[PDB]
Amino acid sequence: PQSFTSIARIGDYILKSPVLSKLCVPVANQFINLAGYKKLGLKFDDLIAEENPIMQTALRRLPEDESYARAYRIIRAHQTELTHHLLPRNEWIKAQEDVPYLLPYILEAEAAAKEKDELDNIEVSK
């Protein structure tokens, strides 16, 4: 368990710096290519686990179409892994279409959860 606030902060810091970006973008691309999940038919906006209640709030905020598409992709992945095959090289998830559709619905709720956990322990102030 590790919040996406820290991840977003680290990511923005890395991306803003130009030289460090030139150093780390190619290795990131090659890593996500060798990750072994684009081919079998997964977007990275699904691999994140679904035990934390914040994840439940995130999913409950999704629109209908994306939830249905996510269900189709996950069940198809289940079946294809069961078969031991991989999908044909026609529906491999192309790199340019790995859009983040779920990250904002994590951060929007993570901020509220963090400020809830903070505001309880307020002081009398002056």
Binding site: A111, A112, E115, K116, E118, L119, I122
Partner: peptide, 12 residues
């Protein structure tokens, strides 16, 4: 400001 993180302070 948030829905309650900066409106509960009204009651406070």
């Amino acid at each position: 400001r948030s829905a309650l993180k900066l409106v509960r302070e009204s009651e406070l």
